Amino acid sequence: KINAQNNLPSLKIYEAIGSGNRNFQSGNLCDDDIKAINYITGFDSPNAKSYLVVLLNKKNYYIRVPQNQIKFKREEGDLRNLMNSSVNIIDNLNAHYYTRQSPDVHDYISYEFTIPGNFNNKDTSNIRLYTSYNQGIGTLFRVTETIDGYNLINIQQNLNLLNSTKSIRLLNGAIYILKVEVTELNNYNIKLHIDIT
Amino acid sequence: SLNDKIVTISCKANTDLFFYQVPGNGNVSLFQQTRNYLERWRIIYDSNKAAYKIKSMNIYNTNLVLTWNAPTHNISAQQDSNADNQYWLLLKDIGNNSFIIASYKNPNLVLYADTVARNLKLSTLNNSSYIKFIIEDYVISDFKNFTRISPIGGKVVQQMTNLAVNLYIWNNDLNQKWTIIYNEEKAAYQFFNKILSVLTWIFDGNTVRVSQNNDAQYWLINPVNYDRYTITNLRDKTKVLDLYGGQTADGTTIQVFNSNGGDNQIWTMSNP
Amino acid sequence: LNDKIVTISCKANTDLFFYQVPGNGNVSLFQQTRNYLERWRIIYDSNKAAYKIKSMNIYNTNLVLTWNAPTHNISAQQDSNADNQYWLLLKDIGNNSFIIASYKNPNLVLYADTVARNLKLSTLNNSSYIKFIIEDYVISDFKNFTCRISPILAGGKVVQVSMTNLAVNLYIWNNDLNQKWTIIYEEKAAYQFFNKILSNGVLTWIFSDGNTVRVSSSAQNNDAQYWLINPVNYDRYTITNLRDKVLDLYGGADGTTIQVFNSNGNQIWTMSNP
Amino acid sequence: RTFLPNGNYNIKSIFSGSLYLSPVSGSLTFSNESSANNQKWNVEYMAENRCFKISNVAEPNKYLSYDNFGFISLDSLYWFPIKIAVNTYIMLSLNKVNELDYAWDIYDTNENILSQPLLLLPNFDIYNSNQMFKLEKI
């Protein structure tokens, strides 16, 4: 997991194509001077908090920062379920919609959102999630954070988000992560709609 | 005084749910009243632990004791290795005579009936009714309220104004319907006939007929296979209701008294 | 056990009984006595499906066992039917004994602090310090009691004559082994009145004659060795033979024969320490 | 520094918002607001064993711990928080008591935790409403 201070600078990670196939020194970076980059994940939006959760190989990776510090952690827990996706952190939520760059087909985006209200494990809210133009398979995780990292409890699977009408009862105050796997690329942006009732 | 007894464990939250060992797999569930070997458990007790173990009388898997699984809170019943997690303190709430079953391995947790998932769990002690249970002898459980005595095959004893004992083939008639109820004051059963508002006898020979504050109208059912039962009268305690001469005729007047373990003296009790 | 007088004693140290310290309002564990302070009246509330353990103290009778506050300590306080003054009595059937849990918090059960000789609370666990023995008070007072029996208006007189004549009568109190007795309890639910001096001797009713009692003993099928004690004060008792559902004492004075004179209906005795 | 930062907190139950953790007579209960220093708790993350130490600010050199009777008390001689919602944790035990995770537990009658000690009881999942505690930073 790669992030920045307060997650504010949204970084974009690339993999150097054909790196690690040549000279290597154990424990040290071997600059291959390869400028052919294969995009992995990231957002170009300047003011949009997001952190990257990417699988990396013992290969050269570039991290692009737009116009502070960069923190790398080696997640080994349930966060592995968010492989190769940027986690757009939603904080303005309080019929909200968030428009981000649409990932390619079979590539993942993730939205981490906190249901408004006070948590008491009894009060819920009917939350409906749906895209606007791009069909994608949805997945929902409940988030529980310990000192060792983050734990994700699977909630649903195989959700058709393209103009979906199904609603799900989610506890107020709890944190959820929606992992969308874009299956149909009918637009350049994905506009995910979170509607609260 | 429940050492080595065959019981059923009803749920105090819903008196129509029973400990039911699902045939096939080993899961225990809260099923409706099925008066057979699946809802029947033995309470053989360990003197060196002051705790009980709850064996099951599933015929095709004899050694199957109630078990608490792992640090999970499930109660699947498996083979008896006499492990610590397989014993259960049987505390009795003196008021209302319900029970609390607390795991011997960790007696901070007690049996909890979901009644929404129809299975059991381990909860912490509450003031609710989902941790109370009713353990009782199966003969009491399956006959405290029941509604067809069939001599050992397809013919059933019956009774409007001709009140007596007969034997005609099953007809789903109102004269061929017997409802058994139990009185835990004389500790005795009665067989009402579901045609009017109790058999009295042993007070001109047999003269078994349906009619009082008389001990004649009281019977004790004692199992003999466990699915066949003998019926003794609470007048002499040695008179057993039987058939006449072991005749399988469809007019036979069933009689009473004596014993000798004759096949005419046993009965396969009602089956709805 | 609604409205029933009992005595709670610990299963670990069986000689320690619940005791309400007079004057002060706390409850501790003390040695076996036979006064009212160790007696508790258990009452059942069916709406609560719970129990109130009244203290049988004669000075302030409206005292119940109470778990004060989140604090561990337990004390006898004036009752108010508060949730913290109600208890759940669970009998362990495989090991005859009681576990007393709190209605306020059933996760917490009474605990016998033996070093402190007090009562605490503890989470339910399989230890002997949480199991107790609740049983009728006249059974506990007399299940094994070396004592002296005396009539009313005859305080300096003990019902007990010598090793030579196995018959007995009233005698003067002189602290002799022929004066003291030992009362034993369970199968027959009655007590035998062994005599201290007369080894293996029991107080027998010879019903050959009408009104006579002696010390004959050694009768398995006896029906007269055993006697039943029934309270009438709570320390004055009457004894009845287990054949008619009774020691009496004629109007006459040292030397008077005791005998089973009349049926139920004098004839009131008290048993106390030697 | 993002998950339970070191500092000072008020501990409440999800059952009530006006009751704060107060150490009365060697047992911890939830009592009304007192605007005092006994209702605040210093949380420090000890990394030598990766655990959390809560102390009473009004009475330092005392640490929250569990005694043999199942209560929770303040000693002078190990906790594992896990977060399930915004400012909401279930305090677990770094030591597996009887090979099973134990956690803080408070009992309630129809959601009323007044005059109820804080106990340590077995934990199975994150769905027990009785074991939920809000650690509001102060």
JSON list of C-alpha atoms in Angstrom, two decimals, chain B residues 61-201:
[
{"chain": "B", "resi": 61, "resn": "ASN", "atom": "CA", "xyz": [-24.20, -43.60, 14.57]},
{"chain": "B", "resi": 62, "resn": "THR", "atom": "CA", "xyz": [-24.40, -44.76, 18.18]},
{"chain": "B", "resi": 63, "resn": "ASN", "atom": "CA", "xyz": [-21.46, -42.84, 19.68]},
{"chain": "B", "resi": 64, "resn": "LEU", "atom": "CA", "xyz": [-22.42, -39.22, 19.02]},
{"chain": "B", "resi": 65, "resn": "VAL", "atom": "CA", "xyz": [-22.20, -36.83, 21.97]},
{"chain": "B", "resi": 66, "resn": "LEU", "atom": "CA", "xyz": [-23.14, -33.17, 22.01]},
{"chain": "B", "resi": 67, "resn": "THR", "atom": "CA", "xyz": [-19.99, -31.16, 21.32]},
{"chain": "B", "resi": 68, "resn": "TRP", "atom": "CA", "xyz": [-18.76, -27.57, 21.42]},
{"chain": "B", "resi": 69, "resn": "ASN", "atom": "CA", "xyz": [-16.56, -26.83, 18.40]},
{"chain": "B", "resi": 70, "resn": "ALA", "atom": "CA", "xyz": [-13.23, -25.01, 18.64]},
{"chain": "B", "resi": 71, "resn": "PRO", "atom": "CA", "xyz": [-13.24, -21.31, 19.63]},
{"chain": "B", "resi": 72, "resn": "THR", "atom": "CA", "xyz": [-16.29, -21.09, 17.37]},
{"chain": "B", "resi": 73, "resn": "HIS", "atom": "CA", "xyz": [-19.75, -20.99, 18.98]},
{"chain": "B", "resi": 74, "resn": "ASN", "atom": "CA", "xyz": [-21.35, -23.95, 17.18]},
{"chain": "B", "resi": 75, "resn": "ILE", "atom": "CA", "xyz": [-22.66, -27.17, 18.69]},
{"chain": "B", "resi": 76, "resn": "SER", "atom": "CA", "xyz": [-22.26, -29.86, 16.04]},
{"chain": "B", "resi": 77, "resn": "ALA", "atom": "CA", "xyz": [-22.47, -33.33, 17.62]},
{"chain": "B", "resi": 78, "resn": "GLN", "atom": "CA", "xyz": [-19.68, -35.81, 16.88]},
{"chain": "B", "resi": 79, "resn": "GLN", "atom": "CA", "xyz": [-18.01, -39.01, 18.07]},
{"chain": "B", "resi": 80, "resn": "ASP", "atom": "CA", "xyz": [-17.35, -39.39, 21.79]},
{"chain": "B", "resi": 81, "resn": "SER", "atom": "CA", "xyz": [-13.65, -39.16, 22.60]},
{"chain": "B", "resi": 82, "resn": "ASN", "atom": "CA", "xyz": [-14.43, -38.17, 26.21]},
{"chain": "B", "resi": 83, "resn": "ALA", "atom": "CA", "xyz": [-12.81, -34.81, 25.55]},
{"chain": "B", "resi": 84, "resn": "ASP", "atom": "CA", "xyz": [-13.11, -31.89, 27.93]},
{"chain": "B", "resi": 85, "resn": "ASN", "atom": "CA", "xyz": [-15.12, -29.86, 25.41]},
{"chain": "B", "resi": 86, "resn": "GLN", "atom": "CA", "xyz": [-17.79, -32.59, 25.36]},
{"chain": "B", "resi": 87, "resn": "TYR", "atom": "CA", "xyz": [-19.11, -32.27, 28.93]},
{"chain": "B", "resi": 88, "resn": "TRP", "atom": "CA", "xyz": [-21.88, -29.97, 30.09]},
{"chain": "B", "resi": 89, "resn": "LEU", "atom": "CA", "xyz": [-22.78, -28.81, 33.57]},
{"chain": "B", "resi": 90, "resn": "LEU", "atom": "CA", "xyz": [-26.55, -29.28, 33.82]},
{"chain": "B", "resi": 91, "resn": "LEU", "atom": "CA", "xyz": [-27.64, -26.56, 36.21]},
{"chain": "B", "resi": 92, "resn": "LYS", "atom": "CA", "xyz": [-31.32, -26.48, 37.12]},
{"chain": "B", "resi": 93, "resn": "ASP", "atom": "CA", "xyz": [-33.14, -23.23, 37.77]},
{"chain": "B", "resi": 94, "resn": "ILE", "atom": "CA", "xyz": [-35.13, -24.20, 40.86]},
{"chain": "B", "resi": 95, "resn": "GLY", "atom": "CA", "xyz": [-37.90, -21.83, 39.87]},
{"chain": "B", "resi": 96, "resn": "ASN", "atom": "CA", "xyz": [-39.84, -23.08, 36.82]},
{"chain": "B", "resi": 97, "resn": "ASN", "atom": "CA", "xyz": [-37.57, -26.17, 36.63]},
{"chain": "B", "resi": 98, "resn": "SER", "atom": "CA", "xyz": [-35.75, -25.12, 33.47]},
{"chain": "B", "resi": 99, "resn": "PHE", "atom": "CA", "xyz": [-32.13, -25.97, 32.76]},
{"chain": "B", "resi": 100, "resn": "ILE", "atom": "CA", "xyz": [-28.90, -24.22, 31.87]},
{"chain": "B", "resi": 101, "resn": "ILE", "atom": "CA", "xyz": [-26.31, -26.23, 29.96]},
{"chain": "B", "resi": 102, "resn": "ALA", "atom": "CA", "xyz": [-22.87, -24.71, 30.56]},
{"chain": "B", "resi": 103, "resn": "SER", "atom": "CA", "xyz": [-19.80, -26.05, 28.80]},
{"chain": "B", "resi": 104, "resn": "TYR", "atom": "CA", "xyz": [-17.41, -27.86, 31.14]},
{"chain": "B", "resi": 105, "resn": "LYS", "atom": "CA", "xyz": [-14.43, -26.64, 29.11]},
{"chain": "B", "resi": 106, "resn": "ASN", "atom": "CA", "xyz": [-15.34, -22.99, 29.78]},
{"chain": "B", "resi": 107, "resn": "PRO", "atom": "CA", "xyz": [-18.35, -22.55, 32.06]},
{"chain": "B", "resi": 108, "resn": "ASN", "atom": "CA", "xyz": [-18.75, -18.89, 31.20]},
{"chain": "B", "resi": 109, "resn": "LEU", "atom": "CA", "xyz": [-20.83, -19.91, 28.18]},
{"chain": "B", "resi": 110, "resn": "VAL", "atom": "CA", "xyz": [-24.21, -21.62, 28.00]},
{"chain": "B", "resi": 111, "resn": "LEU", "atom": "CA", "xyz": [-26.41, -23.08, 25.29]},
{"chain": "B", "resi": 112, "resn": "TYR", "atom": "CA", "xyz": [-28.35, -20.46, 23.33]},
{"chain": "B", "resi": 113, "resn": "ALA", "atom": "CA", "xyz": [-31.27, -21.23, 21.02]},
{"chain": "B", "resi": 114, "resn": "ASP", "atom": "CA", "xyz": [-31.41, -18.99, 17.96]},
{"chain": "B", "resi": 115, "resn": "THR", "atom": "CA", "xyz": [-34.95, -20.00, 16.86]},
{"chain": "B", "resi": 116, "resn": "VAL", "atom": "CA", "xyz": [-34.31, -17.88, 13.75]},
{"chain": "B", "resi": 117, "resn": "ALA", "atom": "CA", "xyz": [-31.48, -20.06, 12.46]},
{"chain": "B", "resi": 118, "resn": "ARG", "atom": "CA", "xyz": [-32.88, -23.21, 14.13]},
{"chain": "B", "resi": 119, "resn": "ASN", "atom": "CA", "xyz": [-29.54, -24.19, 15.65]},
{"chain": "B", "resi": 120, "resn": "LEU", "atom": "CA", "xyz": [-27.63, -23.73, 18.89]},
{"chain": "B", "resi": 121, "resn": "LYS", "atom": "CA", "xyz": [-24.78, -21.48, 19.96]},
{"chain": "B", "resi": 122, "resn": "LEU", "atom": "CA", "xyz": [-22.77, -20.58, 23.05]},
{"chain": "B", "resi": 123, "resn": "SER", "atom": "CA", "xyz": [-23.81, -17.27, 24.59]},
{"chain": "B", "resi": 124, "resn": "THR", "atom": "CA", "xyz": [-22.91, -15.55, 27.85]},
{"chain": "B", "resi": 125, "resn": "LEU", "atom": "CA", "xyz": [-25.49, -15.80, 30.62]},
{"chain": "B", "resi": 126, "resn": "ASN", "atom": "CA", "xyz": [-28.50, -13.54, 30.14]},
{"chain": "B", "resi": 127, "resn": "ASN", "atom": "CA", "xyz": [-31.88, -12.90, 31.73]},
{"chain": "B", "resi": 128, "resn": "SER", "atom": "CA", "xyz": [-33.62, -14.07, 28.55]},
{"chain": "B", "resi": 129, "resn": "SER", "atom": "CA", "xyz": [-35.45, -17.31, 27.81]},
{"chain": "B", "resi": 130, "resn": "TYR", "atom": "CA", "xyz": [-33.03, -18.44, 25.09]},
{"chain": "B", "resi": 131, "resn": "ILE", "atom": "CA", "xyz": [-30.62, -20.03, 27.60]},
{"chain": "B", "resi": 132, "resn": "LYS", "atom": "CA", "xyz": [-33.30, -22.07, 29.40]},
{"chain": "B", "resi": 133, "resn": "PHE", "atom": "CA", "xyz": [-34.16, -25.61, 28.34]},
{"chain": "B", "resi": 134, "resn": "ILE", "atom": "CA", "xyz": [-36.59, -28.34, 29.37]},
{"chain": "B", "resi": 135, "resn": "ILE", "atom": "CA", "xyz": [-34.93, -31.75, 29.69]},
{"chain": "B", "resi": 136, "resn": "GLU", "atom": "CA", "xyz": [-37.47, -34.50, 30.26]},
{"chain": "B", "resi": 137, "resn": "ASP", "atom": "CA", "xyz": [-37.90, -38.24, 29.84]},
{"chain": "B", "resi": 138, "resn": "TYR", "atom": "CA", "xyz": [-38.86, -39.08, 26.28]},
{"chain": "B", "resi": 139, "resn": "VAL", "atom": "CA", "xyz": [-41.83, -41.23, 27.28]},
{"chain": "B", "resi": 140, "resn": "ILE", "atom": "CA", "xyz": [-43.13, -38.18, 29.13]},
{"chain": "B", "resi": 141, "resn": "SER", "atom": "CA", "xyz": [-42.24, -35.92, 26.21]},
{"chain": "B", "resi": 142, "resn": "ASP", "atom": "CA", "xyz": [-43.92, -37.96, 23.46]},
{"chain": "B", "resi": 143, "resn": "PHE", "atom": "CA", "xyz": [-47.07, -38.65, 25.49]},
{"chain": "B", "resi": 144, "resn": "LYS", "atom": "CA", "xyz": [-47.70, -35.50, 27.54]},
{"chain": "B", "resi": 145, "resn": "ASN", "atom": "CA", "xyz": [-49.97, -34.47, 24.65]},
{"chain": "B", "resi": 146, "resn": "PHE", "atom": "CA", "xyz": [-50.51, -36.89, 21.79]},
{"chain": "B", "resi": 147, "resn": "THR", "atom": "CA", "xyz": [-53.20, -38.03, 19.37]},
{"chain": "B", "resi": 148, "resn": "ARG", "atom": "CA", "xyz": [-54.13, -44.79, 17.46]},
{"chain": "B", "resi": 149, "resn": "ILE", "atom": "CA", "xyz": [-52.99, -47.79, 19.49]},
{"chain": "B", "resi": 150, "resn": "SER", "atom": "CA", "xyz": [-51.94, -50.48, 17.01]},
{"chain": "B", "resi": 151, "resn": "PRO", "atom": "CA", "xyz": [-51.26, -54.00, 18.34]},
{"chain": "B", "resi": 152, "resn": "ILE", "atom": "CA", "xyz": [-48.16, -55.57, 16.85]},
{"chain": "B", "resi": 153, "resn": "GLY", "atom": "CA", "xyz": [-50.29, -54.71, 12.60]},
{"chain": "B", "resi": 154, "resn": "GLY", "atom": "CA", "xyz": [-52.43, -52.46, 10.43]},
{"chain": "B", "resi": 155, "resn": "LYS", "atom": "CA", "xyz": [-55.47, -52.68, 12.72]},
{"chain": "B", "resi": 156, "resn": "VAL", "atom": "CA", "xyz": [-56.16, -50.19, 15.50]},
{"chain": "B", "resi": 157, "resn": "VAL", "atom": "CA", "xyz": [-58.30, -50.37, 18.63]},
{"chain": "B", "resi": 158, "resn": "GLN", "atom": "CA", "xyz": [-61.31, -48.05, 18.68]},
{"chain": "B", "resi": 159, "resn": "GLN", "atom": "CA", "xyz": [-64.13, -47.19, 21.09]},
{"chain": "B", "resi": 160, "resn": "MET", "atom": "CA", "xyz": [-70.64, -43.61, 20.08]},
{"chain": "B", "resi": 161, "resn": "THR", "atom": "CA", "xyz": [-73.13, -45.17, 22.50]},
{"chain": "B", "resi": 162, "resn": "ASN", "atom": "CA", "xyz": [-71.43, -48.60, 22.30]},
{"chain": "B", "resi": 163, "resn": "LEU", "atom": "CA", "xyz": [-68.54, -47.59, 24.58]},
{"chain": "B", "resi": 164, "resn": "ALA", "atom": "CA", "xyz": [-66.25, -50.63, 24.78]},
{"chain": "B", "resi": 165, "resn": "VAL", "atom": "CA", "xyz": [-62.97, -51.85, 23.30]},
{"chain": "B", "resi": 166, "resn": "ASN", "atom": "CA", "xyz": [-62.87, -53.20, 19.75]},
{"chain": "B", "resi": 167, "resn": "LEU", "atom": "CA", "xyz": [-60.37, -53.79, 16.94]},
{"chain": "B", "resi": 168, "resn": "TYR", "atom": "CA", "xyz": [-61.08, -52.61, 13.39]},
{"chain": "B", "resi": 169, "resn": "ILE", "atom": "CA", "xyz": [-58.81, -51.73, 10.50]},
{"chain": "B", "resi": 170, "resn": "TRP", "atom": "CA", "xyz": [-57.59, -48.14, 10.43]},
{"chain": "B", "resi": 171, "resn": "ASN", "atom": "CA", "xyz": [-60.29, -45.79, 9.17]},
{"chain": "B", "resi": 172, "resn": "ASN", "atom": "CA", "xyz": [-59.32, -42.27, 10.37]},
{"chain": "B", "resi": 173, "resn": "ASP", "atom": "CA", "xyz": [-62.56, -42.30, 12.36]},
{"chain": "B", "resi": 174, "resn": "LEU", "atom": "CA", "xyz": [-63.38, -40.26, 15.44]},
{"chain": "B", "resi": 175, "resn": "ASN", "atom": "CA", "xyz": [-63.90, -43.51, 17.35]},
{"chain": "B", "resi": 176, "resn": "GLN", "atom": "CA", "xyz": [-60.42, -44.67, 16.29]},
{"chain": "B", "resi": 177, "resn": "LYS", "atom": "CA", "xyz": [-58.62, -41.56, 17.59]},
{"chain": "B", "resi": 178, "resn": "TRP", "atom": "CA", "xyz": [-56.97, -41.65, 21.02]},
{"chain": "B", "resi": 179, "resn": "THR", "atom": "CA", "xyz": [-55.50, -38.54, 22.63]},
{"chain": "B", "resi": 180, "resn": "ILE", "atom": "CA", "xyz": [-53.05, -39.23, 25.45]},
{"chain": "B", "resi": 181, "resn": "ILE", "atom": "CA", "xyz": [-52.38, -36.67, 28.16]},
{"chain": "B", "resi": 182, "resn": "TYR", "atom": "CA", "xyz": [-50.16, -36.79, 31.23]},
{"chain": "B", "resi": 183, "resn": "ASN", "atom": "CA", "xyz": [-50.87, -35.69, 34.80]},
{"chain": "B", "resi": 184, "resn": "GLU", "atom": "CA", "xyz": [-47.75, -35.00, 36.85]},
{"chain": "B", "resi": 185, "resn": "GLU", "atom": "CA", "xyz": [-49.71, -35.12, 40.10]},
{"chain": "B", "resi": 186, "resn": "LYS", "atom": "CA", "xyz": [-50.55, -38.82, 40.03]},
{"chain": "B", "resi": 187, "resn": "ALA", "atom": "CA", "xyz": [-47.71, -39.24, 37.50]},
{"chain": "B", "resi": 188, "resn": "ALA", "atom": "CA", "xyz": [-50.18, -41.05, 35.27]},
{"chain": "B", "resi": 189, "resn": "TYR", "atom": "CA", "xyz": [-51.38, -40.99, 31.68]},
{"chain": "B", "resi": 190, "resn": "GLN", "atom": "CA", "xyz": [-54.93, -41.01, 30.34]},
{"chain": "B", "resi": 191, "resn": "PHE", "atom": "CA", "xyz": [-56.27, -42.01, 26.93]},
{"chain": "B", "resi": 192, "resn": "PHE", "atom": "CA", "xyz": [-59.24, -39.86, 26.01]},
{"chain": "B", "resi": 193, "resn": "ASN", "atom": "CA", "xyz": [-61.25, -40.99, 23.00]},
{"chain": "B", "resi": 194, "resn": "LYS", "atom": "CA", "xyz": [-61.65, -38.19, 20.48]},
{"chain": "B", "resi": 195, "resn": "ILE", "atom": "CA", "xyz": [-65.40, -38.74, 20.05]},
{"chain": "B", "resi": 196, "resn": "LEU", "atom": "CA", "xyz": [-66.72, -37.32, 23.34]},
{"chain": "B", "resi": 197, "resn": "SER", "atom": "CA", "xyz": [-65.37, -35.64, 26.48]},
{"chain": "B", "resi": 198, "resn": "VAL", "atom": "CA", "xyz": [-60.68, -42.42, 29.61]},
{"chain": "B", "resi": 199, "resn": "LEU", "atom": "CA", "xyz": [-60.71, -46.21, 29.97]},
{"chain": "B", "resi": 200, "resn": "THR", "atom": "CA", "xyz": [-61.78, -47.65, 33.33]},
{"chain": "B", "resi": 201, "resn": "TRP", "atom": "CA", "xyz": [-61.30, -51.30, 34.27]}
]
